[PDB]
Amino acid sequence: LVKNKCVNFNFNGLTGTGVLTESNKKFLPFQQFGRDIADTTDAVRDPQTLEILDITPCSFGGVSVITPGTNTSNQVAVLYQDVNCTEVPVA
């Protein structure tokens, strides 16, 4: 198990992609997995050990290209709409 990187996970037939972190949310004795809203599996307890995992969806957003008129110049800048700057280098 790895935690602080976006990963594919399969927990007892529950498949999804996201970043896994230690959950602040507290489960009742044998609830299996939470779904915060709209049946999205936002969390799961591990089957092998018994830790609780909080799941945040894979970071994503829209990319837009800032440019002056190509008539005037060719330099161009790019803006990533919804990401912290430290985690853009991946894509």
Partner: peptide
Amino acid sequence: FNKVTLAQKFNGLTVLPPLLTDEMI
């Protein structure tokens, strides 16, 4: 501002910021 009360994080959905922030309006 303090009277009026006012999207949750999800896939696909995204909310752009308004062009003029409240501080400049």
